[PDB]
Design a protein around this ligand. Structure first.
Ligand code: NN3
Length: 559
């Protein structure tokens, strides 16, 4: 069927939309070529629509039915708990889009009688009505990027806050446990950056002659069919569920997950959806399962050898036993034809790679650096263009989410995150003393409220002391960063070193934790550097739950 149908009404914004980076003193320090940074707006929704709208082609086969059964078999071991209204409400982000029924996120978290009564009614309605499509709002997603040698905005579709709270009750436990029980080590979100690097290396070194490739599905969401969504529910249905949880999942599947009407911000009827809605709790899990299923089956159809998959929602990387240059190009092409039949056509054609560092998955790639000792240490890095553009944007304007804080946590070991991001921001934060102001950022979709003064502990727990001494990065890595700093017009190492030394000092100076920041995060700043040792408070932080499952668009907030 058509992934989308449109009435012709427009996808509208519910407020004004900024697209250009503002001329700002504090923002010019970091990035100079401001006219290169932009934000997507609804003004380009139509371009995205034309690209996501089309009629899906899908042909299942024995390999597909076989992998599905293997997956359903493992799903059978799971027992999922029904979440209480209180626990569900406790998972709702503080600034989640309010309900159109007279209450918002604040009330939901407070457990106010009004928000709770409505959630129950929405739940009762789920147990009783198994057909009526549930309404969803469509909006153009606002994302910053850097011009290219632009990008039309991504589309987001989500239901009312009431329903979202119900999803959590019926499915939170399922989407957080199942992926893991079904795909095992292949499930990406169970890994912190370091562990992913480790899995990618151990998987790589386990083959005699490794051959890997990343696989980019063209607008994965619009490629998800009604069959895929029922196949996905068929997997959930294998869990031991509470009766109401089972009705809720059956009803959420027919009334929301497979499709439904689309309403813009103005109340108008925009059209209909018959594919994955990016804004429901099951998006991340559903996609990870679907992508894993099609890839695992496709790998058998293409005669690829020793298929080790790594899946993160729609992002997919494959590492396997090479069979020869020619043979691998043929096997890989066969793989794409298989995925195309299962309705996962390629965006950019996959390319076999024989150098791990040359593989981009989750917009990242593994790379080598050296620590104080001089021993080789692997870390996860990525082209810094987008992280930096976004940092500039987050410096010039005020935003709910702080990607820089999230990028510093996920990429603390990188040359760019420490040199630029840490220096830039800690400098700005001190100059307004807000090192204690907790900020919100995201990790695998989930929203987190993190304190900037706790970054040393976090970096040591997640990446290890080496992250503070990495040096002698790879040739490829410095080229990228160089090329990047040249492009956006960012001041050279010389300038950052100088700014860091100034931040370090004013940090060691003022106090305790802040001094810890200066001593650890900026140890690369001084020549007569202090010998770094394990930070006590580190093993005190509850990093449980940080890397268990993906929640992109799932409206989740961990406290
Ligand atoms: C002087 C040199 C030893 N160096 C270095 C600069 C590179 C750089 C490359 C491209 C653009 C800007 C800087 S790479 C590279 C390295 O260690 O290989 C360093 O000391 C850095 C300084 C920044 C620290 C976050 C990590 C350590």
């Amino acid at each position: 069927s058509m992934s989308y149908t449109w009435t012709g009404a427009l996808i509208t914004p519910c407020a004004a939309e900024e697209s250009k980076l503002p001329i700002n003193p504090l923002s010019n320090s970091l990035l100079r070529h401001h006219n290169m940074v932009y934000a997507t707006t609804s003004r380009s929704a139509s371009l995205r629509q034309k690209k996501v709208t089309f009629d899906r082609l899908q042909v299942l086969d024995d390999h597909y039915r076989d992998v599905l059964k293997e997956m359903k078999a493992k799903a059978s071991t799971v027992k999922a708990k029904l979440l209480s209204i209180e626990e569900a409400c406790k998972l709702t982000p503080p600034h989640s889009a309010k309900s159109k029924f007279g209450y918002g996120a604040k009330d939901v978290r407070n457990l106010s009688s009004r928000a709770v009564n409505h959630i129950r009614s929405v739940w009762e309605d789920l147990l009783e009505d198994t057909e009526t499509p549930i309404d969803t709002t469509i909006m153009a997603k606002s994302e910053v990027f850097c011009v290219q040698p632009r990008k039309p905005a991504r589309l987001i579709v989500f239901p009312d806050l009431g329903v979202r709270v119900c999803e959590k009750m019926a499915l939170y436990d399922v989407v957080s446990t199942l992926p893991q029980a079904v795909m095992g080590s292949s499930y990406g979100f169970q890994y912190s950056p370091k562990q992913r690097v480790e899995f990618l290396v151990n998987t790589w070194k386990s083959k005699k002659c490794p051959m890997g490739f990343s696989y980019d599905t063209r607008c994965f969401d619009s490629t998800v069919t009604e069959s895929d969504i029922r196949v996905e529910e068929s997997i959930y249905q294998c869990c031991d569920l509470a009766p109401e949880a089972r009705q809720a999942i059956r009803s959420l599947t027919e009334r929301l997950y497979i499709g439904g009407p689309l309403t813009n911000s103005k109340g108008q009827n925009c059209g209909y959806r018959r594919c994955r809605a990016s804004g429901v709790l099951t998006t991340s899990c559903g996609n990870t399962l679907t992508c894993y299923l099609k890839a695992t089956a496709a790998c058998r159809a293409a005669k690829l050898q020793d298929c080790t998959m790594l899946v993160n929602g729609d992002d997919l990387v494959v590492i396997c036993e090479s069979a020869g240059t020619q043979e691998d190009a043929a096997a890989l092409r066969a793989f794409t034809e298989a995925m195309t039949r299962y309705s996962a056509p390629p965006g950019d054609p996959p390319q076999p790679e024989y150098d791990l560092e040359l593989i981009t998955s989750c917009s990242s790639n593994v790379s080598v650096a050296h620590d104080a000792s001089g021993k080789r240490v692997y870390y996860l890095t990525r082209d810094p263009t987008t992280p930096l553009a976004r940092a500039a944007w987050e410096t010039a304007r005020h935003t709910p989410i702080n990607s820089w804080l999230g990028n510093i946590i996920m990429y603390a070991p990188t040359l760019w995150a420490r040199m630029i991001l840490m220096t830039h921001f800690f400098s700005i934060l001190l100059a307004q003393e807000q090192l204690e102001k907790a900020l919100d950022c995201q990790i695998y979709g989930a929203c987190y409220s993190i304190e900037p003064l706790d970054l040393p502990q976090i970096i040591e727990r997640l990446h290890g002391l080496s992250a503070f001494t990495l040096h002698s990065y790879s040739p490829g890595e410095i080229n990228r960063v160089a090329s990047c700093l040249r492009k956006l017009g960012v001041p050279p190492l010389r300038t950052w070193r100088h700014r860091a030394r100034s931040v370090r000092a004013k940090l060691l100076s003022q106090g305790g934790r802040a001094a810890t920041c200066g001593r650890y995060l900026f140890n690369w700043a001084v020549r007569t550097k202090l010998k770094l040792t394990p930070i006590p408070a580190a093993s005190q932080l509850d990093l449980s739950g940080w890397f268990v499952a993906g929640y992109s668009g799932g409206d989740i907030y961990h406290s």
